[PDB]
Structures are given as structure tokens and as C-alpha cells.
Design an enzyme around this catalytic site. Structure first.
Site, PDB file in Angstrom:
ATOM      1  CE1 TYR A  27      31.547  22.345  35.633  1.00  0.00           C
ATOM      2  CE2 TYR A  27      32.217  24.202  37.015  1.00  0.00           C
ATOM      3  CZ  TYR A  27      31.247  23.300  36.595  1.00  0.00           C
ATOM      4  OH  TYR A  27      29.979  23.354  37.134  1.00  0.00           O
ATOM      5  N   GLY A  29      38.243  25.570  30.512  1.00  0.00           N
ATOM      6  CA  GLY A  29      38.440  26.890  29.943  1.00  0.00           C
ATOM      7  C   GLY A  29      38.285  27.918  31.051  1.00  0.00           C
ATOM      8  N   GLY A  31      36.146  30.356  33.449  1.00  0.00           N
ATOM      9  CA  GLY A  31      34.776  30.382  33.887  1.00  0.00           C
ATOM     10  C   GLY A  31      34.352  28.966  34.207  1.00  0.00           C
ATOM     11  CG  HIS A  47      42.860  24.055  39.157  1.00  0.00           C
ATOM     12  ND1 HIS A  47      42.892  25.277  38.520  1.00  0.00           N
ATOM     13  CD2 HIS A  47      44.102  23.865  39.663  1.00  0.00           C
ATOM     14  CE1 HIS A  47      44.098  25.802  38.634  1.00  0.00           C
ATOM     15  NE2 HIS A  47      44.851  24.964  39.324  1.00  0.00           N
ATOM     16  CG  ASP A  48      37.292  26.279  37.834  1.00  0.00           C
ATOM     17  OD1 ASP A  48      38.415  26.010  37.360  1.00  0.00           O
ATOM     18  OD2 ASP A  48      36.348  26.717  37.148  1.00  0.00           O
ATOM     19  CG  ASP A  89      48.639  25.626  40.199  1.00  0.00           C
ATOM     20  OD1 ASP A  89      47.416  25.901  40.222  1.00  0.00           O
ATOM     21  OD2 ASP A  89      49.528  26.502  40.206  1.00  0.00           O
TER      22      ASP A  89
HETATM   23 CA   LIG Z   1      37.578  27.116  34.764  1.00  0.00          CA
END
Ligand SMILES: [Ca+2]
Length: 120
Positions: A27, A29, A31, A47-48, A89
Site C-alpha cells: 500500500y 506505492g 494503488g 493513509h489510502d 498526512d
Molecule cells: Ca497506496
């Protein structure tokens, strides 16, 4: 924006943002799918999910206001959007810094990311 997020990560972890997390786990990177390879990877998961809820705003480009106060990162924005993005963040930055100890560069070379879409 991503630059500020980058600054944060560097302050908390002490590692070059993109070349240490740009392709980490399933996760960190771009996508993401499958099971989190580890604590750090889990940080990137959260975070995604955080970014999805922040649809209205532009998570990667939204310029927000953040400052340091005795080491601590504080998001001082009145705009609900820029604030929410900032908190996404901030959280991630602190989560990556609290798990830098179990950081293993092998997770950017070896990955087992199944097709199951995780919980948000
Ligand atoms: Ca990601």
C-alpha cells in the site's frame, strides 16, 4: 500536497520519502490491495483509506497549513478540506516514524498482495 507530506515523513522517520516508501509493501506505492505486509505497510493502508474519504479536496495537490510546535506537527487550517488532508498526512507520518524500527527493505522487493480489498 505530496511535497509537504514528504517533508513530514522525513522529519519523523529520517529517511528519503520516495526511495524508501515509494514502492514499499502493498500500500505504500501507488494503488494497493492484498494484506498489509507489516506495520509500516499498514500505515500506508490507513493513509489510502484516509484519502478516499477526502474526495472533495485534491489530496495530492491540496496545499494546507501545518507547523511545528516543540517537535510536534500541528495542522492549523480553518478549511475543513485542507485540514482533513493535513491530518491524513500527519497521522501517516507519525505512524511510519513509530515503526521505522521494523522497516525492512525486503518489502520493496518481495510482495504477496492478494486480490482482497481491505477494510477502510
Ligand atoms: Ca497506496
Amino acid at each position: 500536497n505530496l511535497y509537504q507530506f514528504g517533508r513530514m515523513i522525513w522529519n519523523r522517520t529520517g529517511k528519503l520519502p520516495i526511495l524508501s516508501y515509494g514502492s514499499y509493501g502493498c500500500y505504500c506505492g501507488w494503488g494497493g490491495q492484498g494484506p498489509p505486509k507489516d506495520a509500516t505497510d499498514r500505515c500506508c493502508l490507513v493513509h489510502d483509506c484516509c484519502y478516499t474519504r477526502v474526495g472533495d479536496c485534491s489530496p495530492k495537490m491540496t496545499l494546507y497549513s501545518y507547523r511545528f510546535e516543540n517537535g510536534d506537527i500541528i495542522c492549523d487550517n480553518k478549511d475543513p478540506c485542507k485540514r482533513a488532508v493535513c491530518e491524513c498526512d500527519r497521522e501517516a507520518a507519525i505512524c511510519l516514524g513509530e515503526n521505522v524500527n521494523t522497516y525492512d527493505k525486503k518489502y520493496k522487493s518481495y510482495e504477496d498482495c492478494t486480490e482482497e480489498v481491505q477494510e477502510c
